[PDB]
């Protein structure tokens, strides 16, 4: 009846999945597409005890096992379709003229999305609507806005990362949380970690939330505690066993761990809308202190950040509070950590976009604003990746089809701010396209971006803490 979204979304995704793979025409050491191809290559030609040791200077495996296994499966299938593509040590830099193997990879991304991202968010919106007894048209719109989140759609297709999988897995975790299937929620979580360690950002929530709910909230229940301890440890064991047993043993476990969390290098070498990338340009941390002081200050900052949310979670676990506190903790992590790159913002964008289902107007307005901002702060990467056009294509599309031509909150303060930032974004897009930097320090516009994003995200996270504290009024939870 409504499945039209289920197909126009996929059409949109595949239409974007025609752009340039990252690092196109990058002779020495190609972009990310080459990394994925290379991991799929070397996973199907070496024993299990030699996936992490093979070539640690050329895109050596970097993610937890599940990435390895998934890439191994896809490599098997691609070999079946054609083995000449995965020539070990020979097809290192494959560039076909007829666009072979590109449509293949894009199909892989699409299928992974469809399997692990679509149904989660769809069923979740179904659940919320069902509970709040809203018009089916409303729920259809509340799903079609989500699935067209521009940032994620762009970064998966074209830039070629599988963020969708881990995102959808944590979505399944949240769902299972709603329907109280806690023992399955923990397992969906531990699955989401093992695909990309980057999804540890929500652990400070799920820890306290499961703790309070099972152990403490209704009563001092005990059974479910051993239940979840059983389940999570079981997940870790069954996902790491092929390494220890079928491989070098504890040596390979230690190598895997220290290869997931490599030691820090350099200081503030990447321009991201972090907290230090901004204040580094005034205070010049490089000289003020050593490196260990900064790695301790960043840790203390992140802990101070996500602590109040954890305390409030342990204090008042309620289903109508999750997206707020997930945003609190995810943003606390992405705002103060030491080495963050240009993405990861998607990982806060999960519990942001999960809010479309809300009934208030301010929240929807804010969420659309912040999604536009996030889409913006990724422009440098895209620009230096091709995608001259698809940026604005999706930029337009998403804002149009969400009903932006009739729009802003009911408060001039917020209105003034939103419009000002929109001007700024429009403004900046000139100062690079035709203006050259003062040449006294050329890479300025990018630092202007590192800056203009920070204000937005900071005020957003503050409003998230706000919405936490102002709410908790035992509101109907039908919100």
């Amino acid at each position, epitope marked *: 009846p409504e499945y039209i979204i289920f197909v126009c979304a996929v059409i949109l995704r595949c239409t974007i999945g025609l752009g340039p793979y990252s690092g196109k025409g990058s002779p020495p050491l190609y972009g990310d597409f080459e990394a994925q191809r290379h991991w799929m290559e070397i996973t199907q030609h070496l024993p299990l005890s030699k996936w992490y*040791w093979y070539d*640690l*200077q050329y895109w*050596g495996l970097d993610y937890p096992p599940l990435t390895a296994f998934h890439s191994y499966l896809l490599g098997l299938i691609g070999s079946f379709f054609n083995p000449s593509w995965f020539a070990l040590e020979k097809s290192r830099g494959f560039e076909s003229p007829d666009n072979g193997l590109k449509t293949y990879m894009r199909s892989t991304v699409i299928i992974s999305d469809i399997l692990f991202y679509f149904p989660a968010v769809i069923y979740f919106t179904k659940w919320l609507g069902r509970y709040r007894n809203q018009s089916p048209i409303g729920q259809s719109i509340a799903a079609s806005a989500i699935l067209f989140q521009p940032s994620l759609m762009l970064i998966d297709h074209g830039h070629f990362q599988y963020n969708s999988v881990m995102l959808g897995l944590t979505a399944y975790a949240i769902n299972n949380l709603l329907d109280e299937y806690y023992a399955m929620a923990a397992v969906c979580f531990v699955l989401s970690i093992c695909f990309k360690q980057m999804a540890l950002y929500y652990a400070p929530i799920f820890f306290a939330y499961l703790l309070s709910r099972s152990l403490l909230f209704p009563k001092f229940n005990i059974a479910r505690l051993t239940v979840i301890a059983f389940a999570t440890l079981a997940t870790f064991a069954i996902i790491f066993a092929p390494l220890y047993f079928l491989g070098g043993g504890l*040596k390979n476990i*230690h*190598q895997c761990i*220290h*290869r997931i969390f*490599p*030691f*820090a*290098r*350099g*200081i503030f070498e990447d321009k991201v809308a972090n907290f230090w990338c901004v204040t580094n340009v005034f205070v010049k941390y*490089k*000289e003020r202190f*050593t*490196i*260990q*002081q900064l*790695q*301790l200050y960043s840790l203390i900052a992140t802990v101070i950040g996500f602590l109040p949310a954890m305390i409030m979670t342990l204090l008042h676990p309620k289903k109508h509070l999750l997206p707020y506190v997930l945003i609190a903790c995810s943003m606390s992590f992405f705002l103060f950590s030491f080495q963050v790159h240009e993405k990861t913002i998607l990982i806060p964008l999960l519990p942001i976009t999960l809010l479309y289902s809300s009934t208030d107007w301010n929240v929807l307005s804010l969420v659309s604003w912040i999604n536009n901002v996030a889409l913006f702060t990724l422009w440098p990467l895209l620009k230096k990746d091709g995608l001259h056009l698809q940026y604005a294509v999706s930029f337009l599309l998403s804002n149009w089809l969400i009903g932006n031509f009739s729009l802003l909150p009911y408060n001039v303060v917020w209105k003034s701010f939103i419009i000002g930032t929109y001007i700024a974004m429009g403004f900046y897009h000139f100062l690079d396209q035709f203006v050259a930097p003062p040449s006294k320090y050329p890479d300025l516009w990018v630092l202007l971006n590192c800056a203009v994003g920070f204000i937005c995200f900071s005020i957003f996270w503050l409003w998230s803490y706000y919405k936490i504290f102002t709410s908790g009024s035992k509101s109907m939870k039908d919100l």
Partner: antibody, heavy 122, light 110 residues
Framework: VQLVESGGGLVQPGGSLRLSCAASGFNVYSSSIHWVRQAPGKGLEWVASISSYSGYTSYADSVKGRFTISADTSKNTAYLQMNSLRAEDTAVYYC????????????????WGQGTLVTVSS | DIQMTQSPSSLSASVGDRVTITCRASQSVSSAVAWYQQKPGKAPKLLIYSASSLYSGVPSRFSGSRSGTDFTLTISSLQPEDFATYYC???????????FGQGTKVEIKR
């Protein structure tokens, strides 16, 4: 808990060598081998290194290209290949372990090889 | 780029005396500086690491410190069996080249 060196003797300029360093009872994939050379009657001087987790060779600004470090944890071995061997490269060479940890917290250069002689002459 | 200036070139002091060696850094972006001792012929032996931690296996008459960019080592009760050459050694972080001092030789005063 005691390194050993091997490979050392006269080599004419333009020659080549490959010094080997074998460990004893400590993994060599968690130690970040260095090769510290000492010229005769002069002070210590670092040459090449490794990170043991991400193959981050870093060669001193005098040995760009002419040398090449390598490791192998299959047998707790570390190698230093040498290709040019100008006349002044004559020295003593030690392999040296250094155990980092979390938060870039060094632990210094615990274990030193006993030291090999290298004489570059014609 | 990276180096350290070890001062002074050469001291002399008889037993019981207390003496101090300085090591002016170049850019204070790391606090991992070790102090080594070398007898003639042998291979150097670690004394102090992380700029203040005395190694386990060394008499406690040694004491290090950091002063902004001017690391410092002190020996309180200089014994006669402590005459060797002492080396300041800095390492920035994992994949970054390290650098040694220029050499400091204690010897007897007479």
């Amino acid at each position: 808990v005691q390194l050993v060196e091997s490979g050392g003797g006269l080599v004419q300029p333009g020659g080549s060598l490959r010094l080997s360093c074998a460990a004893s009872g400590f993994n060599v994939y968690s130690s970040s081998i260095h090769w510290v050379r000492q010229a005769p009657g002069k002070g210590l001087e670092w040459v090449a290194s490794i990170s043991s987790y991400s193959g981050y060779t870093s060669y001193a600004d005098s040995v760009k290209g002419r040398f090449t470090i390598s490791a192998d944890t299959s047998k707790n071995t570390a190698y230093l290949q040498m290709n040019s061997l100008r006349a002044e490269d004559t020295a003593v060479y030690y392999c040296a372990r250094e155990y980092w940890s979390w938060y870039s917290y060094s632990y210094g250069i615990d274990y030193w090889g006993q030291g090999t002689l290298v004489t570059v002459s014609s | 780029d990276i180096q350290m200036t070890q001062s002074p070139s050469s001291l002399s002091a008889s037993v019981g005396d207390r003496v101090t060696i300085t090591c002016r850094a170049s850019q204070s972006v790391s606090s991992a500086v070790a102090w080594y001792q070398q007898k003639p012929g042998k291979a150097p032996k670690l004394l102090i690491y992380s700029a203040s931690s005395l190694y386990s296996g060394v008499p406690s008459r040694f004491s290090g410190s950091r002063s902004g960019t001017d690391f410092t080592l002190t020996i309180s009760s200089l014994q006669p069996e402590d005459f060797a050459t002492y080396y300041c050694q800095q390492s920035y972080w994992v994949g970054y080249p390290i650098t040694f001092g220029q050499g400091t030789k204690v010897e007897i005063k007479r």
